[PDB]
Amino acid sequence: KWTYFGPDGENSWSKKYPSCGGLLQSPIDLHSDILQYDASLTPLEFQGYNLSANKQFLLTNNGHSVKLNLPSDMHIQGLQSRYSATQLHLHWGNPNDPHGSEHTVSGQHFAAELHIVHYNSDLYPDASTASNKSEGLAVLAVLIEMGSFNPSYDKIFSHLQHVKYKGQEAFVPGFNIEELLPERTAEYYRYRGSLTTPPCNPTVLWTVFRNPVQISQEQLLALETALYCTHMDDPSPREMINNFRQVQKFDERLVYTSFS
């Protein structure tokens, strides 16, 4: 059992999950001193991101986040290996402190963060097998700030009242996942890191887009208030809030940028 609060919280994860105290942990603060321009960081191609609108995809409350299952025909091109999609999920704060992004930029939290998880389908036969192996995973990270209402994010958020409790599921019709990505996806940070949740394996190639997307105050407040980490039958509910890991030491590592 692990939480983001109290005795079972992030300072104690290493007691249950060895890699959480290991090398190459994520997330990190993106700041000037550790950035290095790299011209060989070329645009990624998002292939099969336009999901079949005639297909439905499973949304689950797994007690730590809300997760959308993705099909393996969706993938990233441009990296050395092909990486096929497995799921996306989010990280957020709470109404009294709506700064719940995992990555920070010059010490500043965004409201929230989206992760699109991909596994190395050239080297490994599935995402579970890949997760603890060399070059196993690649995540796209989208930083989210309070702003304009986002119709694309609402294709997920519109279903939150039907996954309020741990283990609840809802079907989401196919839409274009590329719509969840910000402007100028050519501009990104790249570094070698880890899962930000147990088991914290140091197997992730990270791509954090430079530009945030916006969702509205009300979309943000829905995300922060809809979900519980407890089961529906539990008469002592706990709210699912502040499900973000604190930033990690970045000792020796640099962050490579496609922009300058």
Ligand X SMILES: CCCCNC(=O)c1cc(S(N)(=O)=O)c(Cl)cc1NC1CCCCC1
Feature table: binding site: 89, 91, 115, 196-197
Nearer to ligand X, 155 or 245 (CB): 245
- Contact status: 235 vs a copy of itself (CB under 8 A): no
- Contact status: 104 vs a copy of itself (CB under 8 A): yes
Give the tokens for residue 166.
């741990």
For the CB of residue 138, give the shortest distance to ligand X in the complex, in Å.
Answer: 8
- Contact status: 10 vs a copy of itself (CB under 8 A): yes
The Cβ of residue 117 has, within 10 Å, a number of other Cβ atoms equal to: 20
- Binding residues for ligand X, rule: CB under 6 A, are 62, 64-65, 67, 86, 89, 115, 117, 127-128, 131, 137, 139, 195-197, 204
Nearer to a copy of itself, 100 or 138 (CB): 100
Nearer to ligand X, 37 or 124 (CB): 124
Rounded Cα distance, 88 and 195, in Å: 13
- Closest C-alpha to 248, from 8, 2, 23: 23
For the CB of residue 26, give the shortest distance to ligand X in the complex, in Å.
Answer: 6
Active site residues: 64
Binder of residue 131, out of a copy of itself, Zn ion, ligand X, none (CB less than 5 to 8 A by kind): ligand X
For the CB of residue 228, give the shortest distance to a copy of itself in the complex, in Å.
Answer: 16
